[PDB]
Amino acid sequence: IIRGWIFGTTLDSKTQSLLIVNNATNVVIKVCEFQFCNDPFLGVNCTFEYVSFKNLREFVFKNIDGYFKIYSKHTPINLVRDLPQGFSALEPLVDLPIGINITRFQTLLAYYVGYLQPRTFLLKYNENGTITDAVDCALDPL
Amino acid sequence: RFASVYAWNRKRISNCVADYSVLYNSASFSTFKCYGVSPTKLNDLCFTNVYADSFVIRGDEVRQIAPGQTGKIADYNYKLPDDFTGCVIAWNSNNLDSKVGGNYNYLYRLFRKSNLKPFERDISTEIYQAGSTPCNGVEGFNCYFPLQSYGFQPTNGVGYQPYRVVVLSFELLHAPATVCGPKKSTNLVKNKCVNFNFNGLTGTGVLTESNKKFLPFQQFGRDIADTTDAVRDPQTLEILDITPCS
Amino acid sequence: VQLVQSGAEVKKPGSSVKVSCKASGGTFSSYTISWVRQAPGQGLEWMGRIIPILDRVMYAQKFQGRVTITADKSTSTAYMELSSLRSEDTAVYYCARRAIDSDTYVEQSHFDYWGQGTLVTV
Amino acid sequence: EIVMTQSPATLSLSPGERATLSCRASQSVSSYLAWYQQKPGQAPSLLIYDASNRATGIPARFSGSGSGTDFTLTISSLEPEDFAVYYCQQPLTFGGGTKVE
């Protein structure tokens, strides 16, 4: 059901915002003054446009100096109640030179949301460049 | 098809490689006048956006699409700002745009009540009052339809022949560059001491084959001292260890 | 600033007449040429006019659909043709000129010169 | 169109006397009124333009005034040669014309 997100600030469907969503078999990424449904349902001026439980899709998103950074990783699940624990690192997929601010977002139809902050980590690398572990340097005295 | 000058067209060019070698070295252009930029350095420039202004005017009107100009075209059809950055390119289109009976499908604004601001277009059909009596929207004595068609004919002298004029307007610092010219590469030379530049990663050293396996994302690596260990080539993804020159 | 008109003609009702006036060279770059008719025993009536610098023509309502006004820029000659003539169309057809400002297109309402007039009998 | 009326249709004066002609339009033309003097055998001669401006070659005895819809021609003193038919012209129409005898 979740096919994407809308990111932006005002998000009033009158100004431009960033829409990342599945469109048939391709994903469309665009920034436009699109008249969005206030709460869209997916059944059965522009800056740019680009066109490309069961398992978990993890993502991390940040917006730096106008560049929207998209990262992800997929992992199999045999759970029916909550998120799995364990360690993996997400890989970057997309880097979008848009020039807009993001303060709010909407999910396009279990979903979980956390927030990022400037923590320091000690990262353990494998022989092949993989991040295999990490220490959250602000978590406790050890 | 180019727009008439009053019906000015504007194409937005973004997220691409701005190869201008096709334009500044073109012998088909009679005019290639760059403002703030050098024609042969256009490939070294980056823009947030490039806008392409595409229209048809007479030969003696070519000079009007420029910063600092005034006149019926410069003031009523299209104005460029006095501090305009970009290039005004023009060529004769007598064999494309002129028609034997006159290519009157092209029009320019002859009448307006004010001058245009930079990058302003005016496609209004409001009847202009030239005289003292009201027109009330109707053509008549000292009341005119604002547009004047062009008698572009194959037999016109050069100043009256049509020209296809394109202005490439350069937008900077509103958003990150999305339009940049091409980057020229060299051959890849192995087992020699060289001065290298892989995209934006530079240094001096000897390039030899690496036994490293980079994650698909990783393009280059780092040693324990955070010096470059190896660099994967930008065209063929081979990883080359960089040995310091002895 | 002279204007020489063609001489008199006699037409069968239902036929057309093409009346022409020759202006001094250079007239077309600074003047418009209007047509005025005078039926014998009557006053003046305006029929229409051409502006050579705009390629525009304006007509009297009673002649819309009946009169075509044009000009030949290479011969400095104004033309008017009435498509279908009736006996009430007997008149002296005059050409007369109004100066026009080529930058603003403000036309004068008065004639600073009239030709002698062309009499067409129907 | 603009309907124009001239008045009186005819005037009767001796040479040496003052005469005026009135013209009225159904529509305003601001100042765009031309006055012409026509004699038999001649195309009308412009006397006055833009309601009150004397035409080149026309003597000082001719003057006038008016605006909008209401205009007047004045001949301060008629000469034996002024017993002509006068016409009021606007950009689109003419009045019937007035005879001075």
Residue numbers in the entry:
A (entry chain C): 100 to 143, 165 to 172, 186 to 242, 264 to 296
B (entry chain A): 346 to 591
C (entry chain H): 2 to 52, 52A, 53 to 82, 82A, 82B, 82C, 83 to 100, 100A, ...
D (entry chain L): 1 to 91, 96 to 105
Paper excerpt:
The S-protein is a glycosylated, homotrimeric type I transmembrane fusion protein responsible for host cell attachment via its receptor binding domain (RBD) to human angiotensin-converting enzyme 2 (hACE2), a process that is enhanced by a coreceptor, cellular heparan sulfate. The S-protein is made up of the S1 domain (residues 1 to 685) containing the RBD and N-terminal domain (NTD) and the S2 domain (residues 686 to 1213) housing the fusion machinery. Clinical candidate monoclonal antibody J08 binds the severe acute respiratory syndrome coronavirus 2 (SARS-CoV-2) S-protein independent of known escape mutations and is able to potently neutralize most variants of concern (VoCs). A relatively small epitope footprint high on the receptor binding domain (RBD) ridge and the ability to bind multiple conformational states of the S-protein contribute to strong neutralization across several variants.
In the SARS-CoV-2-6P-Mut7 + Fab J08 complex (conformation 3), Fab J08 bound to one RBD-up while the two other RBDs were down. Unlike the Mut2 complexes, most particles had a stoichiometry of only one Fab per S-protein trimer, although there was a small minority of particles with two Fabs bound in the negative-stain electron microscopy and cryoEM two-dimensional (2D) classes. Alignment of the RBD-J08 X-ray structure onto the first cryo-EM conformation 3 down RBD (clockwise from the antibody-bound up RBD as viewed toward the viral membrane) reveals that a direct clash would occur with the up RBD. In the up conformation 3, the antibody is tilted slightly, increasing the number of CDRH3 contacts, consistent with the X-ray structure of the RBD-Fab J08 complex. Accordingly, in conformations 1 and 3 and the X-ray structure, the heavy chain interface residues (defined as contributing greater than 5 Å2 BSA) all reside in CDRH2 and CDRH3. K417 is at the interface with J08 in conformations 1 and 3 and the X-ray structure, contributing a hydrogen bond via its side chain amine with CDRH3 in conformations 1 and 3.
